[PDB]
Design a protein around this ligand. Sequence first.
Ligand code: HEA
Ligand code: HEA
Ligand SMILES: [Cu+2]
Lengths: 70, 256, 607, 178
Amino acid sequence: XXXXXXXXXXXXXXXXXXXXXXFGFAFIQAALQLLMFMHMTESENGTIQVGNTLFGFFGAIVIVLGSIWI
Amino acid sequence: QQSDLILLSIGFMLFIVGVVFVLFTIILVKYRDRKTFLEVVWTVIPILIVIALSVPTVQTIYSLEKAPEATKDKEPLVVYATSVDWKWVFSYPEQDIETVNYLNIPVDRPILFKISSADSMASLWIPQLGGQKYAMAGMLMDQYLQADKVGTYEGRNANFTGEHFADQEFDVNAVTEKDFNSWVKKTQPKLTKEKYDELMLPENVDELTFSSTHLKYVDHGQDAEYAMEARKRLGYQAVSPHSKTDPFENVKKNEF
Amino acid sequence: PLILGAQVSIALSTIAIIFVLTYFKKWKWLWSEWITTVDHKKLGIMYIISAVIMLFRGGVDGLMMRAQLALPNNSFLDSNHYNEIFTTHGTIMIIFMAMPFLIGLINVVVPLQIGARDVAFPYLNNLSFWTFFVGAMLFNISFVIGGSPNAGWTSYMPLASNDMSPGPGENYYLLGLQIAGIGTLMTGINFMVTILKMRTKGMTLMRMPMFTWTTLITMVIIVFAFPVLTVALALLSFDRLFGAHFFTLEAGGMPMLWANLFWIWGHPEVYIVILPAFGIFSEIISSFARKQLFGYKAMVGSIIAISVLSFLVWTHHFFTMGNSASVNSFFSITTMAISIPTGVKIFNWLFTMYKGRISFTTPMLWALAFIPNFVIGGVTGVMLAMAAADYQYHNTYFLVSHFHYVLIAGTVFACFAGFIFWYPKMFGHKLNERIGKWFFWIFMIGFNICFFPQYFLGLQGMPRRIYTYGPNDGWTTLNFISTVGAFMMGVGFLILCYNIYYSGVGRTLDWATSSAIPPHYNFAVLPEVKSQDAFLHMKEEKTELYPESKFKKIHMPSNSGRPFFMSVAFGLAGFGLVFEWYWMGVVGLIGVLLCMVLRSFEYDNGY
Amino acid sequence: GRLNILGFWIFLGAEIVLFSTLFATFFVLKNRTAGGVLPDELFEVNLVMIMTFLLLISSFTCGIAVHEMRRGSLKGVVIWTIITLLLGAGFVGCEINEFVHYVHEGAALSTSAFWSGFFVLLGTHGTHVTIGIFWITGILIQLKKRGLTPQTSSKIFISSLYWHFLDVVWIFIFTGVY
Ligand code: HEA
Ligand code: HEA
Ligand SMILES: [Cu+2]
C-alpha cells in the first residue's frame, strides 16, 4: 500500500528523464534510486547496511570523475 | 637538471628524519632494560614538512608546462620522436631529415620533442635532460628540453620490457650552433618508402642516416594502427618457443 | 629450455611422492579434518604454509635474478627468461605470498582475539582458501606446461596481447588472479561482518584493541578495491581470448585505460598489505613492552584517514605519462597528505615502548628492525610523491629500492613476526630462540646491502627490467654489492626451515585459551572483557577462568565437500581457457556449468 | 536472526564499484569509433526495457512488504514472486534480441572499441539479471517439503534486495549509455 506511492512516483522520473533529451540530469538518476532503496535498509542491522553503500557511491564518483579527469 | 635541486635539497630533509629516529631510539631503549597533548601538538609540524614541498613542486609542475630552459618564447625547433620496438626514430619537420637511434641538437635551443610510439609504450629518459615523457601510441605528447653543456648525453627508455628492450640505449649529442648547421647541410639517402616499413621489426640496427622526413605517412602520432600494416604485411608474428627468427620471409637490415 | 626440463621431472616427483608416502589412506584425515575443513584455525594454517611454499619459489627466482645481475656481460639468463623470472617473482609475492600470509595470520589470530567461535560464514571462507589455491596452482603450472608471463607484475596492455606474442603467457596472469580475486573478495566480506556482529559481550567497538582494528580496515578496502580487479582482468581477459578491443592498439582502444583500472585497484590494495603488517606489529610492540597503546583518538582516527584517502592518490604511479599538469599536482599534494596519517603511527610505537620495560626476543627483533627499515623506505617514497621530480627517478631501481624497503620491512617482517610470535598457537612449544637470532641478524644486515646500493644504482643511471648494465662509469660494483646482499638474505631460509624441523607476556585473548593448540570450539565461555586489554585485567586483577557447570551446547558447523569441487571447477575452467583455446573453451564452459550447478547446491542444502 | 542479510549486503556495495569501473571504462571509450559504426540505437526499446524494470520493482517494492511483513500471504508467494519472475525474462529476451539485431553492423566486441564496453557494461549486467532468475526460482523450491515462515526463510529477502540492486545501476545505465 505504502510502496505503491513510491513505485508510482518512480515511473514519473523515468518519463521525465526522456524529456531531458527528447548535474541537472545526473541527480534525478540517484534520486530515483534513493526512493527505490529507502524502503528496505534500516534498521536493526542498519547504519552499517545503509552506510556501506554511502562510501560505495563515493568511489563511483572518485572512479568515474577521476578517470574523466585525465 | 632544473628539478635536480629538489633532489639534493630534499635529501638532507630526510637525512635529518633518519637521524631523528636514531635519537628517538638509540638515546633510550638501552637505558630502560630490566638488566593526548603531544599528539595534538605534533599536528603542527607534519604539514610543515610537506607544505614546504607542496608549493615548490607545484610551482615546478606548472613550470615544466610553459617554455622551459633558457629561451623565453623564441627559437621554436620541433623534432617528431617516434618509438618502435627496441629502436628509436626521430624525424625533423623543419627540414626533410630523419635520424634513427641517434640525435643531434644545438646547445641552448628550445626543442619541442613530439613524443609518440608505434607499437609499444615507451619514454625517452636521457638521464642528462631530466624529466621523461611516456611515448603514447595514439597521440603526441609535447615536452621541451635543452642542453646544459657540450658533451655526450646518454639515452635510454622507460624499458617496459619485451625481449629486446634493455639495449634501447641510443646515444645523443649536443654540439654548437655552427657545427649543427653543417650537419644538416651534408646529409640532406632518402625516404625509400619501404625501408620505413622495414623498421617496425624488432632486431638490432646501426646508424641509418636517412636524409628525408617520414611524417608524410599517416602522421604516426595519430592512427597508431601501423602495427598490423607493419609486422603482418611482411608476414611475421612471433611466438615464445621455436619457429621464430621472424616466421620466415626475409628482407631487413640487421647486425653484423 | 634446458633448465626447465629438470623441474618438470621434479614436479612430477613431488606429486609421485605424495601418492606413495602420504596416500596410504587419506579419505579419513586429509578429506575429513582438512581440505574441506571448516575450523578457522586449520584454514589459516593452510594459508601461511602455502605462502612459505611460495617463498621458496619466489626465492630461487629472486636469487637467480640478481645472480644473473651480478656484473655486466653476464650470461646466466637470456632475454626471454629474465623477463619471465622477474615477472613471476613479483606476482608470486603480494598476490600469492603476502596475501595468503597476512590473511593466514588474520584467519587465525583475529577470530581468537574477538572471543567469537569461528567467522561469520565459515563455509564461504572454506572455498576462499581453495579459490586462491586453484589460482595459485594455475599461476604455478605456467612453469613448464605453458609459459610464464614476461610483462611484469603490472603487465601493461600494449605489450600483452599480440605485440607480446606468447599465447599461454598473460592468460595465466589473467585467469590466475581472476579466481583468487573471488576468494579474496569473500575474505574481506566474511571478516567485515565477523568483527561487526560476532563480538563477545563487553568488547566495545572503540577498543578491541588496534590490531583487530587494522584487520577491520584491511577487509574494508578489499570489498571496495577488488571488484575493480575482477573486471579489470575480465576486460583484459576479453581482449586476449574473446576478441575485445578495450585497450587493443589495433581497433583504436585506449592503451592507458587499463593502467588506471589496475592502479585504482593497485594502491588501495598496496595498503591492504601494510595494514595487517601494522596491526601485527602494533600488538607485539605493545605486548612484550607491557604498556598501553597511548593514542586512540589520533591512531584509530588515523586508520580511517588512509582508509578513504587511499582512493584519491592512486594517480601517482602515472605522472610520467604527461597528464593535465594540475591533475599531476592534485595527486602529488594529496600523496603528501597520506604520509601524515601513516606518519603518526610510527610516533605511536616509540612512545608505547618508552617508560615501560622491554625484553628483546625473536618477535621483538622483527619489531625492532621494522621501525627504522620501514622509515628508511618511507623517507624515499616521499620523494616519489613529488611529481615535479618523479619524472627523473621514475622506474630506474630507485623506485624498486624505495618499495623493497617499504614492504619487506613492513609485511615480510610482519609475516615473520606473526610466524614466531603466534607459532605456539599452531603446535606445541615454539621456535628455538638463540639460533633464531642467527636468522634475524643475517637476514637484517643483508637486507640493507641489497637495496641501499640500489638507491645509488638507480640514481646513477641503472633502469629497471634490464638483464645487462654494461661498463657505465664504473657502476659495476654497486650492482654486485646489491647481489651479495641479495644472496645474503638467501642464507637464512635454510635456517628458517631448519628451525621448523623441531617438530610469554600476553595482553589480549592470545594465551587466554584453555591450553596450547586451542580446541575446536575455542573458549568454552565468552569473556566479558569490558576493558581495553582483557588478559592483563584478567590476571593480576581478580582471576576469571572457564568454570565448569557453566558450559553449554556446541556450534555444529560441520564440513561440506563442495568448496573443493567448486574451486576445481574454477581451476578447470581457468586452465582450459589459458592453455591454448584462444577463441573459446571446450572445458572452460564446463567449469561455469559445474559452478552454477554447485551454486544451485548452495541454496539447496539445509544445515 | 541471520547475519547473511548484512554479509550479502556489503557485497551489493562492492558491486557499486564493480559497475563504476565499467562505467569509467565506457565513459573514456565514448569518443572513440574513429573507424567503424556510429551508435544509433532504437529509442522506444530503451523505455520499454526501463518501464518494464521500473514496474518490475513496482511489483517487488510491495512484493515483500505487503507480502510477508504486512499480514501473511503465504499463498501469494506463488503469485507475487512468480509474476515478478516473468518480468525478469522480459529484460533477458529483449536484450538478447537487441544484441542479435546488433549483428547487422556493430556485432560483438570486434567492430569497434566503443561497442566492446557497451556489450560488456550491459554484458555482466545481462548476466547478473540472468542468474537472478535462476536464484529467484531456486527459492521457489521451498514451498514443498520445507515451506518456512517469515523471519526464518531469509533466502527470499537476501535475493530480493540483490535483485533490487540491479535496478540501481539499470537506471544509471539508462542515463549512462543513453
Ligand atoms: C613482497 C614483496 C617482495 C619480496 C619479499 C621480494 C623478494 C626479493 N626480491 Fe623482489 N620484487 C618485487 C617485490 C618483492 N621482492 C616486485 C613488486 C618486483 C617487480 C615485479 C615486476 O614488475 O615484475 C620485484 C622484482 C625484483 C627486483 C627488480 C627487478 C628489476 O628491476 O630488474 C629485484 C632487484 O634485485 C628483486 C630482488 C629480490 C631479493 C633479493 C628478494 C629476497 O627477499 C629473496 C627472498 C628469498 C627467500 C626468502 C628464499 C631464499 C632462496 C633460497 C635460499 C634458495 C637457494 C637455493 C638454490 C638457489 C638452489 N626482486
Ligand atoms: C605496502 C605497500 C606500499 C606502501 C605502504 C607504500 C607507501 C608509500 N609510497 Fe609506494 N610503492 C609500492 C608499495 C607501497 N608504497 C609499490 C609496490 C610500488 C611500485 C609499483 C610498481 O611500479 O611496480 C610503489 C612505488 C611508489 C610510487 C610510484 C612511483 C612511480 O611512479 O613509479 C609512489 C608515488 O607517490 C610512492 C610513494 C609512497 C608514499 C608517499 C607512501 C607513504 O604511504 C609512506 C608513508 C611513510 C612516511 C611518509 C615516512 C614515515 C613518516 C614519518 C617518519 C613522519 C615524518 C615524515 C614526514 C613528515 C615526511 N611509492
Ligand atoms: Cu601508489
